[PDB]
Design a protein around this ligand. Structure first.
Ligand SMILES: NC(=O)c1ccc[n+]([C@@H]2O[C@H](COP(=O)([O-])OP(=O)(O)OC[C@H]3O[C@@H](n4cnc5c(N)ncnc54)[C@H](OP(=O)(O)O)[C@@H]3O)[C@@H](O)[C@H]2O)c1
Ligand SMILES: NC(=O)c1ccc[n+]([C@@H]2O[C@H](COP(=O)([O-])OP(=O)(O)OC[C@H]3O[C@@H](n4cnc5c(N)ncnc54)[C@H](OP(=O)(O)O)[C@@H]3O)[C@@H](O)[C@H]2O)c1
Lengths: 238, 237
């Protein structure tokens, strides 16, 4: 069996990534706060091989100690072959006005919980064989790569995740653990539904979540990629 | 007029405070250590009539203290230069790094700088042309490339830089310019434990005064915002 953990599996990029991973034969564990929405995604996931099975994990990533301990998880951390750290929350505000508890919670969900989950996986896995590396894939953002007004703390969270990624990649490559970020541009999901007009881009229009999922698959099957960013942004930052 | 330097008690911050005071700024030194802050304060040049220096006992593990300028000798709007210098380092295998420890590191290195920044932005008078407010983060090359066993440290410094770029775009039109300096291996108490250097293009340790020269270049600048000034002896070239 192969197992993939997708946080934020209840909709958007995570749901799309989960579907594609299940089509490739992975047992997928969907993790988020919403049991009913998780179950609905679970019901749509492909089955491509007998014995394949999917799981849900009720997990609030505002709770960093739960992440750290894999609290409630259906399988031990060492069972996973792919970890798609996809859960995140956005916030649009003048920096002067952004409520302190709101921006601190954003950091906990976007940066501290991924850190804690990664630590828990590294501890349990310890090392991997050369034929079956563990792939850790952060869903970061182009906001971590260039400055956009009124998304400062969000940008901090994503740039921070990418900085963690490069250091972990160098540390654990010799253990057979490969670690990368995908940095999406404007992608049509619940998170960006409040945006009513896009910037003028070299490739026009919204990106679909399924397009980000194809980049997850590219990394999940990869062999010689670690410590890098895969930017899927319609040319926003070119 | 006024410069705020967090982590003013030693190292890069102390050297930066000395150079800013040489330039005529009234310097506020902030850190946890009132006695060491007073020792540095006594060494700060006085070069201009009416010039005055201050200390501020501030623990950046307390993010709400930062956010409210708790205990500050001057309001946030009085500052013309903000050197966000305080920071802490930690070395560990990621798998074994104590949760309270790495969370406290994020608070000191990232969340408190964000909070001090928000306080300054909220209080400031939009700035005249020849007197922009300069915000200068002391980040690290660790935030630009991957080094093993400093993962959460690297996350803090990369996060600081991502914050910096977004704030720069946002507040430039208010006359507020915002940049990071990313040092390499510098001779301070932070590095006294870890001595063999890598094989560098420019050999040897960097002096804290050398970082302070970069602070002064930014403090006097006019057309720089959203960027990184890398002073690293060629480590990352
Ligand atoms: N859409 C874009 O334009 C775009 C661009 C760049 C990057 N991203 C990144 O893409 C990732 C996925 O976002 P999305 O665009 O697919 O938006 P989305 O459809 O709103 O998905 C957000 C996901 O995160 C989960 N989540 C949020 N807060 C959580 C918490 N406290 N604990 C557990 N799970 C939580 C949500 O599940 P529950 O609500 O069920 O808990 C949901 O499954 C995010 O990391 C985001 O920053 C998005
Ligand atoms: N040295 C290097 O090679 C190097 C390289 C890259 C970046 N840096 C960065 O340079 C900055 C300055 O460090 P340094 O090398 O000059 O080290 P240092 O001499 O040890 O100085 C660190 C300063 O930070 C203050 N600080 C630490 N924790 C604090 C807290 N909780 N509240 C308030 N102040 C606190 C310390 O003052 P108290 O102890 O008095 O509170 C001290 O003044 C740091 O941000 C560091 O990450 C250093």
């Amino acid at each position: 069996t192969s197992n993939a953990l997708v946080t934020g599996g209840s909709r958007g990029i995570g749901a799309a990534s989960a579907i594609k991973l299940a089509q490739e034969g992975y047992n997928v564990t969907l993790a988020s706060r919403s049991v009913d929405k998780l179950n609905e995604v679970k019901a749509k996931l492909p089955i491509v091989q007998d014995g394949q099975k999917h799981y849900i994990w009720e997990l609030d990533l505002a709770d960093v100690e739960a992440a750290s301990s894999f609290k409630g998880a259906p399988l031990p951390a060492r069972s996973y072959d792919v970890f798609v750290s996809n859960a995140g929350v956005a916030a649009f505000s003048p920096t002067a006005d952004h409520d302190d508890k709101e921006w601190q919670n954003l950091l906990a969900v976007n940066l501290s919980s991924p850190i804690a989950l990664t630590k828990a996986l590294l501890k349990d896995v310890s090392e991997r064989p050369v034929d079956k590396p563990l792939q850790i894939i952060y869903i970061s953002s182009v906001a971590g790569l260039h400055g956009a007004a009124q998304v400062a703390v969000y940008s901090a969270s994503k740039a921070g995740l990418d900085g963690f990624m490069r250091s972990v990649a160098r540390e654990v490559g010799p253990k057979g653990i490969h670690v990368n970020s995908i940095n999406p541009g404007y992608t049509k999901t619940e998170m960006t539904a409040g945006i009513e007009a896009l910037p003028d881009l070299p490739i026009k229009g919204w990106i679909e979540p399924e397009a980000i999922a194809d980049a997850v698959l590219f990394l999940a099957k990869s062999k010689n990629i670690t410590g890098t960013n895969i930017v899927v942004d319609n040319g926003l930052i070119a």
